[PDB]
């Protein structure tokens, strides 16, 4: 029973991971072949850059604007920055924008989403000059709608690129996210790889490695079949016509009669998928963005993402059939995720109830083997020895994702104490249950027998696992003091943050 479950879990995980790796490699080869035929100084497609932010750090906003200006693309019609401001606090972002891009900043007193006339001519009259719009705080979706409307004013614009207010772009980042658009007529959205630049904490390193693995494996596998489930938030590209067509359903999203505020960068991708269009992700475009470093905010963000995913998978499954033979892989991936979550919960419950020492030892050993295999693959792909830290991602996964999943499932339907209860009470209950199961397992098996090989095997395995974990933690601590784990880009950001 337990051995069968462990075996099927291992085979399932390894098979899916190898299949995704092969698909990502094939997609990378296809994109490389497409790029190899790209003529030099290719600027056929006119692209407009749209940046949306809210209360962003002035240094991060300035660096993002400088990186946008550092782009080598010579076919940028204009830069559109939309800030949901209309307040004295938000004036700092406008002041920072002026020091980097022109002077003309407009602050209309109405929102295009809630206005009778949604055309951009009401608030803008010139398309040659870069424009910044300050509007009352409504949401990220409302800010993006204004940018989409402003970009659609110029007929010469053929595609748009969405960049977050705290995203650092490379010189060729814009070219790499717009070249695949012209490769195939059915391609309408392009996603770019996002890499975390700040890795000064143990959580930041794990988040960065998880992001890198996701982008280089799962998004590549999706792009091979042109069924990308979610485009890159900080870095992404869209076609003007599809955006103009699907802006109204995106801005008028209703789940059970109530407006949906969060879940950005997912409903738009789902709407693109419903039209049968193809989405291709490229790894050659690199965007740098920050990641949360606190457990509480990371858990909140993961709970929000889980809620968005739960809302979106229904429509994703309902629209996957429109791709014909395509979309079968996407449905299989969704079923994989659901069955994997359910299977993980079932094995956790079985381990807690049975508390058979042979079961936990085998589960720990197979999990360690999977982590070593994944870390070796990441190191081989990234050509960096720091990828071995992904073995520690299991702890943060267990302590964050499952409580976030439970919170998302329970709070989907139906003073400060009640508000605080909906965030971390479920996580605290999960932690207490895990601790209770652990202490019950330890107490129930309070015996020693060196004459039994099975008990000896379990003790040796658990001792080796603890020794390996301690060695990894010691190595990370040594690297942190030496500051070798810091990303190459982080050193400069620190340098001109100090020199400021």
């Amino acid at each position, epitope marked *: 029973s337990a051995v069968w479950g462990i075996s099927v879990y291992g085979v399932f995980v390894l098979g899916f991971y190898i299949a995704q790796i092969v698909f990502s490699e094939f997609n990378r080869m296809r994109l490389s072949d497409w790029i190899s035929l790209r003529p030099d*100084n290719w600027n056929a497609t006119r692209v407009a850059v749209i940046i949306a932010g809210y209360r962003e750090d002035p240094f991060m906003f300035k660096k993002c604007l*400088e990186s946008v*200006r*550092d*782009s*080598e*693309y*010579g076919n*940028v*019609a*204009r*830069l559109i920055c939309v800030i949901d401001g209309d307040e004295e606090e938000d004036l700092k972002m406008a002041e920072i924008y002026k020091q*980097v*891009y*022109n002077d003309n900043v407009k602050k209309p007193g109405v929102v295009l989403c809630e206005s009778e006339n949604k055309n951009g001519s009401t608030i803008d009259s010139d398309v*040659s*000059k*870069n424009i910044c719009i300050l509007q009352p705080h409504r949401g990220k979706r409302e800010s993006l709608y204004t940018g989409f409307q402003l970009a659609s004013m110029d007929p010469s614009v053929h595609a748009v690129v969405l960049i977050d207010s705290d995203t650092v772009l490379e*010189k060729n980042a814009i070219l790499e996210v717009v070249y695949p658009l012209s490769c195939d007529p059915n391609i309408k959205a392009v996603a770019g790889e996002c890499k975390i630049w700040n890795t000064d904490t143990i959580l930041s390193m794990l988040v960065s490695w998880r992001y890198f693995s996701a982008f280089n494996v799962e998004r590549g596998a999706q792009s091979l079949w042109k069924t990308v489930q979610c485009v890159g938030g900080p870095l992404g590209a869209y076609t003007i016509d599809i955006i103009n067509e699907i802006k109204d359903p995106w801005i008028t999203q209703t789940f059970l009669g109530n407006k949906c505020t969060y879940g950005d960068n997912r409903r738009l991708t789902n709407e693109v998928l419903m039209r049968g269009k193809k989405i291709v992700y490229t790894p050659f475009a690199v965007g740098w963005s920050d990641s949360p470093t606190n457990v509480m905010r990371y858990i909140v963000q993961q709970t929000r993402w889980s809620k968005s995913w739960c809302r979106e998978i229904w429509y994703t499954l309902g629209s996957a059939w429109k791709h014909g033979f395509s979309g079968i892989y996407l449905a299989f991936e969704c079923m994989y995720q659901i069955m994997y979550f359910f299977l993980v919960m079932y094995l956790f419950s079985y381990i807690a109830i049975k508390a058979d020492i042979r079961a936990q030892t085998a589960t720990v050993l197979v999990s360690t083997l999977v982590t070593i295999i994944k870390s070796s693959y990441l190191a081989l792909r990234a050509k960096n020895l720091k990828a071995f830290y992904f073995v520690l991602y299991t702890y943060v996964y267990f302590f964050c994702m499952i409580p976030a999943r439970i919170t998302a499932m329970f709070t989907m339907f139906d003073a400060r104490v009640w508000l605080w209860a909906k965030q971390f009470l479920i996580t605290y209950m999960w932690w207490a249950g895990v601790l209770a199961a652990g202490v019950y397992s330890i107490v129930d098996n309070w015996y020693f027998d060196w004459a039994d090989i099975q008990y000896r095997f379990a003790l040796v395995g658990i001792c080796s696992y603890l020794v390996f974990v301690s060695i990894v933690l010691v190595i990370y601590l040594i690297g942190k003091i030496t500051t070798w784990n810091y990303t190459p880009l982080q050193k400069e950001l620190i340098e001109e943050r100090y020199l400021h």
Partner: nanobody
Amino acid sequence: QVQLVESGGGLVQAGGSLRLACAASGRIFSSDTLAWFRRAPGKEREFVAASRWSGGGTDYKGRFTFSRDNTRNTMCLEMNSLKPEDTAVYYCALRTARDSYYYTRNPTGYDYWGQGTQ
């Protein structure tokens, strides 16, 4: 913000060639437009050549070619097969893309200007 300093000059016969180098003191951002402008006695300045820092280029010509170093913040525009009417005072100018990304040959659009030689 950006200071442009040019080098090269002197008197040259109708048969010969020479090279002019303009040095930029600041940040180019790989998007600003740099052009060479010359003034003749009795007439307004006319466009000669320009090219973006990232790439591209334009002339008017073929006789004159544009080159950039891109690591020392230096730019050069050498002249081949000179003519007596081609003699003029050359200026180094830079165009910023903060106001707009459109390309124009109007000298009024350029904000940063340098000194003249020869």
